[PDB]
């Protein structure tokens, strides 16, 4: 300004989704 | 007829209920057939509320009116610096 205030201071997923099949 | 049972409408089309449910739902996928079926009781119901027109007008105005105030950002922030 310079006046006033300022000058003061489930993933993506790849692996897990493919694993859901062979899990159960 | 909007509301109809699936078994006797498959009797009018002379086809099995498996590919009647999947083809009709495929017609809903194409949006040309307005309605939906019901698998639990074997029902098919047609309903529609076509017009979006007012929302099209609204969106067309305001979405561009964003860039309008962006265009006014050039002039009205130029007098500052």
């Amino acid at each position: 300004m310079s006046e006033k205030k300022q000058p003061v201071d489930l993933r993506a997923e790849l692996e897990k989704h493919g694993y859901k099949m062979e899990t159960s | 007829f909007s509301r109809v049972q699936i078994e006797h409408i498959s009797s009018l089309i002379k086809l099995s209920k498996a590919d009647v449910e999947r083809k009709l739902s495929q017609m809903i996928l194409d949006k040309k057939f307005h309605g939906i079926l019901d698998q639990g009781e074997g029902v098919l119901i047609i309903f529609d509320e076509p017009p979006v027109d007012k929302t099209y007008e609204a969106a067309l105005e305001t979405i561009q009116n964003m860039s309008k105030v962006v265009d006014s950002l050039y002039n009205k922030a130029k007098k500052l610096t």
């Binding site: 300004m1 310079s2 006046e3 006033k4 205030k5 300022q6 000058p7 003061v8 201071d9 | 922030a77 500052l80 610096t81």
Partner: protein, 480 residues
């Protein structure tokens, strides 16, 4: 040695010109602007003085020492003199001292000579017409000098400028009469050195003696010169009163008024950041999010530097307490980024419904929480995790058992499972219905309504009251 010795002459001529003609053209021009028109005010050299002061606040200021023409202090501070036709001879005496400074050493060092100098305008007796010219001729050396922070023997000289400003304050309580068209520029200049009151007093401890003195000045400007005076003095109040307890939350209630008109420009926006943290202490999140957003969105153009980034930092704090926040990593600047780096993972932990993710953020970033000053809401946000966590899973899951959801809701016993959703409807979260036996939470939704009435009916008064104000502006700006 020859290079550094011959590079001393080049720098001074630039302050010898612009720093000489800045208060000569603006201050001397404001003299003719203060003789007539009077319209009513304007006094466009007051805002031009703001441009010159903000220009000095970066480069080069004046002193310090710099060992370049320290005779600029006695130049404008002496030789009114005295009545206007006699002042014209002194207007030639500034050129006379330009030749005297162009011949001899030109008194490149003042230092302890400020004692007779600063008291020379009181030796003239007097200017006598323009107090802003006397206050500015003394302060313009001293006010940029506060940026040196030498803290030896010149701090009481800044206090002498504060006493000269107190003589400006007594004259701010008297004449008037009538339309002291120069007191708006006195509101401008004094607000500056009232913030220099803040800085110089903050060199040791709080200014509390000047809190009763500020209340003396803020109340004596009531109701006459409060315009543009009360706004800056209220920020002078609110800033350090936000640093030192107490009662300012209820004090600004009875203080308002508003206080209209908002001046100048970003002053009201930063005030809505100051009182924005205030109104955020009451925790009502619609008024807090609107006062925090309107604080940052209303502030052009910067630089400098990081406090305009600080209002954006604390802005979305109330949005974290709302329960829904976007990921702000795309809004990071080259500076604001490195400042908020802990606050990044904080709002990322607010988006997620995980408890350990948010608690680990608290334990690790607690040091940065001490730097910002916002603490108390970090522990209660766990209730925002249980409400957003249940908003998540309920709408998410078809029918969820109270034992399976008990992992993310961390208790979710067969009893409190009723209240989690029920008391969320009290807060307007989720409509999920639960028949409790084992049990299981079956979440459905049917709502078709609203999105209509209040938006369009308010837009009527919004647009109309707006264009009415734009009328009050354009219709009144046609004086030329």
């Amino acid at each position: 040695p020859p290079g550094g010795g011959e590079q001393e002459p080049p720098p001074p001529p630039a302050p010898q010109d612009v720093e000489m003609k800045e208060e000569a053209a603006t201050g001397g021009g404001s003299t003719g602007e203060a003789d007539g028109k009077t319209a009513a005010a304007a006094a466009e050299h007051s805002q031009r003085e703001l441009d010159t002061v903000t220009l000095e606040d970066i480069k080069e200021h004046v002193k310090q020492l710099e060992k370049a023409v320290s005779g600029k202090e006695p130049r404008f501070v002496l030789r009114a003199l005295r009545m206007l036709p006699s002042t014209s001879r002194r207007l030639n005496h500034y050129v006379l001292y330009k030749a005297v400074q162009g011949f001899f050493t030109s008194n490149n060092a003042t230092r302890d000579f400020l004692l007779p100098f600063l008291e020379e305008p009181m030796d003239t007796e007097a200017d006598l017409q323009f107090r802003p010219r006397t206050g500015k001729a003394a302060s313009t050396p001293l006010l940029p000098e506060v940026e040196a922070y030498l803290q030896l023997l010149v701090v009481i000289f800044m206090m002498n400028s504060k006493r000269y400003k107190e003589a400006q304050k007594i004259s701010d309580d008297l004449m008037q009469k009538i339309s002291t068209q120069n007191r708006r520029a006195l509101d401008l200049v004094a607000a500056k050195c009232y913030y220099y009151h803040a800085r110089v007093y903050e060199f040791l401890d709080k200014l509390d003696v000047v809190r009763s003195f500020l209340h003396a000045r803020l109340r004596t400007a009531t109701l006459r010169h409060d315009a543009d005076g009360q706004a800056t003095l209220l920020n002078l109040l609110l800033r350090n009163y936000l640093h030192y307890s107490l009662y300012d939350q209820a004090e600004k209630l009875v203080s308002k008024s508003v206080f209209p008109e908002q001046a100048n420009n970003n002053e009201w926006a930063r005030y809505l950041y100051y009182t924005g943290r205030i109104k955020a202490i009451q925790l009502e999140y619609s008024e807090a999010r609107r006062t925090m957003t309107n604080a940052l969105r209303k502030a052009p153009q910067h630089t400098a530097v990081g406090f305009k980034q600080t209002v954006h930092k604390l802005l979305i704090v109330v949005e974290l307490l709302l329960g829904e926040i976007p990921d702000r990593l795309q809004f990071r600047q080259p500076s604001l980024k490195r400042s908020l780096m802990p606050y990044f993972l904080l709002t990322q932990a607010v988006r997620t419904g995980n408890l350990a993710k948010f608690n680990q953020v608290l334990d690790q970033f607690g040091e940065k929480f001490q730097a910002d000053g916002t603490y108390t809401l970090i522990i209660r946000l766990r209730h925002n995790v249980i409400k957003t966590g249940v908003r998540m899973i309920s709408l998410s899951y078809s029918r969820i058992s109270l034992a399976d959801i008990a992992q993310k809701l961390q208790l979710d016993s067969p009893e409190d499972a009723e209240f989690i959703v029920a008391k969320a409807i009290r807060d307007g979260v989720i409509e999920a219905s639960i028949n409790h036996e084992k049990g299981y939470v079956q979440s459905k939704e049917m709502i078709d309504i609203y999105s209509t009435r209040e938006p369009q009916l308010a837009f009527h008064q919004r647009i109309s009251f707006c264009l009415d104000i734009h009328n009050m502006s354009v219709k009144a700006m046609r004086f030329p």
